[PDB]
Amino acid sequence: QVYEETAGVRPGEPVVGTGASLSVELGPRLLTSIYDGIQRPLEVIREKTGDFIARGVTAPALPRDKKWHFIPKAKVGDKVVGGDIIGEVPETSIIVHKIMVPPGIEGEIVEIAEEGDYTIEEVIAKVKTPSGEIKELKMYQRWPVRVKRPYKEKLPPEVPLITGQRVIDTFFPQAKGGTAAIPGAFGCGKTVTQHQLAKWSDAQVVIYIGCGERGNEMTDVLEEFPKLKDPKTGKPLMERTVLIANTSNMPVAAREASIYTGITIAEYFRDMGYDVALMADSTSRWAEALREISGRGYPAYLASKLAEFYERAGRVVTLGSDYRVGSVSVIGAVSPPGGDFSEPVVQNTLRVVKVFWALDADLARRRHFPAINWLTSYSLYVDAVKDWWHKNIDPEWKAMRDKAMALLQKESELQEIVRIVGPDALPERERAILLVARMLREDYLQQDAFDEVDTYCPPEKQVTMMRVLLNFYDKTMEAINRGVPLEEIAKLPVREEIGRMKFERDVSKIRSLIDKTNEQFEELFKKYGA
């Protein structure tokens, strides 16, 4: 009935064309709302077996009945282009919904509604185009989900997207507008980590796509997600979120379209000037959308539209008369059918994902959390975001990061060698590298998502914690170079404080550990001379 390819010639079966595309309606009831892959609202069902299960039913994506408060931000006579913000609507206690001229419309505002309460079908403005056509603007707009929402310019990766998780921000940074992947494999704290990312990343709006990887995933979404609170405001997280759902019972077509629906809604909040995080966990439900197309995508080339999906991520100068910037960053769950990867990252094009956080079950079982393998993870955005860190937070950010990574790489080499020849023949220098590498692992990489302080680590705290550790490293190598025994260094009281600094809120108290470290090594130099 509705199609991408234009219905000129009529095919066999009885099918009535609509001269329209598969589209979404945009705002201002997108927030707090739960759809399927074609933006049909949710249908709650009786428990019966399992706990809960849902299906999409044909109905309006946005309520026509509710009255929204419109504040005008333009006047009669103002010249206007696509993306220009002609009003505002408090959609939610956190998010102001910006009402924008649809793309491809420009001209003079000849009529705009005064401040008041209106439903979304009400015309709140009229624009006269250069040819004199009068266009009626409402509080919502439609867009075809399979077409990039346009923008002026895609900016190169530059600003990090602060997650507040030390291992990510320091070693494997995501950029605002960037593309990241995480394994879908269960039993390694993926749920804690995705949860932390949604809650703490400095995006104003979150779009979450998957909700049916487990049999009892729908019930957890419907029951718990309304209880979850945005820790930055104290208000519900649902109030800055939009949920899309993919399940075994929903049709194959809806789930294929789900990522396009999601990223279109993301692009729409981007266009307002917001930073948006699009998070996809529907990988197994999305993957089984693979279908028999026995006739006549093809053996010539695989489904490379997944490249074009990830291609829609980015930070952009948006449409509009004012200079304005917004972003969609993508964090997607990926998984192998078998145990080994089976070439899933090299399957899709030539590495469209620029960041990979390798959740690792062995790390999980050793209680190292978050369980991100610091040897198999990568980010191609380290050089792209370093200047932001250098200029705003710490001039030595990249140098410290590289130095800490080098120590971790050395640690890994030594542990392998030691596995063979034992630890007893290790020189002091080597033992010192292992001591400090262990401190890096325990005092910096490991982070406690369940702790009131350490659930989030501000940029300033990250660099200060790093300086403390690397200053301890420098002093350690300086000390053994002067024949101070490593047993003595391993027993320095300040080590104990460095171990707990992650639980300290006051960054100045953490910073003072540098001097405290520097004056206790002196009490060792006094005990051993020179």
mmCIF file of N, CA, C and O in Angstrom, residues 431-432 435-436 439 472 476 480 484-496 521 524:
data_model
loop_
_atom_site.group_PDB
_atom_site.id
_atom_site.type_symbol
_atom_site.label_atom_id
_atom_site.label_comp_id
_atom_site.label_asym_id
_atom_site.label_seq_id
_atom_site.Cartn_x
_atom_site.Cartn_y
_atom_site.Cartn_z
ATOM 1 N N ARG A 431 59.140 -5.814 38.207
ATOM 2 C CA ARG A 431 58.189 -5.951 39.300
ATOM 3 C C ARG A 431 57.515 -4.607 39.555
ATOM 4 O O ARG A 431 56.341 -4.563 39.884
ATOM 5 N N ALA A 432 58.263 -3.523 39.382
ATOM 6 C CA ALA A 432 57.713 -2.178 39.519
ATOM 7 C C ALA A 432 56.666 -1.873 38.442
ATOM 8 O O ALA A 432 55.648 -1.240 38.728
ATOM 9 N N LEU A 435 53.535 -3.720 39.474
ATOM 10 C CA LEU A 435 52.886 -3.048 40.596
ATOM 11 C C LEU A 435 52.022 -1.892 40.102
ATOM 12 O O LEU A 435 50.846 -1.805 40.443
ATOM 13 N N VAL A 436 52.611 -1.021 39.289
ATOM 14 C CA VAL A 436 51.910 0.160 38.793
ATOM 15 C C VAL A 436 50.812 -0.194 37.781
ATOM 16 O O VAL A 436 49.746 0.418 37.793
ATOM 17 N N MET A 439 47.922 -1.162 39.797
ATOM 18 C CA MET A 439 47.279 0.040 40.317
ATOM 19 C C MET A 439 46.417 0.719 39.245
ATOM 20 O O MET A 439 45.331 1.177 39.543
ATOM 21 N N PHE A 472 53.028 8.549 40.576
ATOM 22 C CA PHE A 472 53.471 7.425 41.390
ATOM 23 C C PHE A 472 54.395 6.514 40.594
ATOM 24 O O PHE A 472 55.365 5.976 41.137
ATOM 25 N N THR A 476 58.229 5.797 41.479
ATOM 26 C CA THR A 476 58.602 4.398 41.646
ATOM 27 C C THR A 476 59.863 4.050 40.849
ATOM 28 O O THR A 476 60.770 3.416 41.375
ATOM 29 N N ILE A 480 63.583 2.955 42.606
ATOM 30 C CA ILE A 480 64.348 1.739 42.350
ATOM 31 C C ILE A 480 65.648 2.047 41.594
ATOM 32 O O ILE A 480 66.642 1.340 41.760
ATOM 33 N N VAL A 484 66.198 1.806 46.045
ATOM 34 C CA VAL A 484 65.158 1.641 47.069
ATOM 35 C C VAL A 484 64.421 0.334 46.774
ATOM 36 O O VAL A 484 63.992 0.121 45.643
ATOM 37 N N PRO A 485 64.266 -0.547 47.778
ATOM 38 C CA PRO A 485 63.603 -1.824 47.504
ATOM 39 C C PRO A 485 62.130 -1.664 47.113
ATOM 40 O O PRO A 485 61.425 -0.816 47.668
ATOM 41 N N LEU A 486 61.681 -2.484 46.168
ATOM 42 C CA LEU A 486 60.308 -2.432 45.700
ATOM 43 C C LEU A 486 59.290 -2.827 46.772
ATOM 44 O O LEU A 486 58.157 -2.345 46.744
ATOM 45 N N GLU A 487 59.679 -3.706 47.694
ATOM 46 C CA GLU A 487 58.822 -4.062 48.835
ATOM 47 C C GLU A 487 58.402 -2.819 49.615
ATOM 48 O O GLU A 487 57.276 -2.730 50.083
ATOM 49 N N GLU A 488 59.325 -1.876 49.748
ATOM 50 C CA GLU A 488 59.089 -0.640 50.481
ATOM 51 C C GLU A 488 58.112 0.265 49.722
ATOM 52 O O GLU A 488 57.224 0.893 50.322
ATOM 53 N N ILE A 489 58.274 0.319 48.402
ATOM 54 C CA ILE A 489 57.404 1.128 47.551
ATOM 55 C C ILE A 489 55.997 0.543 47.535
ATOM 56 O O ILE A 489 55.019 1.283 47.589
ATOM 57 N N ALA A 490 55.906 -0.785 47.486
ATOM 58 C CA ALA A 490 54.619 -1.485 47.499
ATOM 59 C C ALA A 490 53.851 -1.291 48.814
ATOM 60 O O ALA A 490 52.637 -1.507 48.861
ATOM 61 N N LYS A 491 54.571 -0.904 49.868
ATOM 62 C CA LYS A 491 54.000 -0.674 51.193
ATOM 63 C C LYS A 491 53.782 0.806 51.515
ATOM 64 O O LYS A 491 53.314 1.118 52.606
ATOM 65 N N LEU A 492 54.136 1.716 50.607
ATOM 66 C CA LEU A 492 53.893 3.133 50.855
ATOM 67 C C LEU A 492 52.419 3.320 51.214
ATOM 68 O O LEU A 492 51.536 2.837 50.504
ATOM 69 N N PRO A 493 52.155 3.955 52.362
ATOM 70 C CA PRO A 493 50.775 4.199 52.783
ATOM 71 C C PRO A 493 49.895 4.899 51.742
ATOM 72 O O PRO A 493 48.728 4.563 51.620
ATOM 73 N N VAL A 494 50.450 5.859 51.010
ATOM 74 C CA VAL A 494 49.689 6.614 50.012
ATOM 75 C C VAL A 494 49.057 5.726 48.916
ATOM 76 O O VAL A 494 48.023 6.093 48.346
ATOM 77 N N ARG A 495 49.668 4.572 48.631
ATOM 78 C CA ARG A 495 49.063 3.571 47.747
ATOM 79 C C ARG A 495 47.633 3.254 48.144
ATOM 80 O O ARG A 495 46.761 3.086 47.291
ATOM 81 N N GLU A 496 47.408 3.148 49.445
ATOM 82 C CA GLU A 496 46.094 2.834 49.980
ATOM 83 C C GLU A 496 45.085 3.931 49.652
ATOM 84 O O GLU A 496 43.923 3.649 49.349
ATOM 85 N N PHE A 521 57.928 9.252 49.463
ATOM 86 C CA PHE A 521 59.120 8.757 48.777
ATOM 87 C C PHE A 521 60.384 9.408 49.356
ATOM 88 O O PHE A 521 61.443 8.786 49.379
ATOM 89 N N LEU A 524 61.433 7.604 52.285
ATOM 90 C CA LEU A 524 62.173 6.411 51.846
ATOM 91 C C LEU A 524 63.610 6.750 51.469
ATOM 92 O O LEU A 524 64.526 6.000 51.799
#
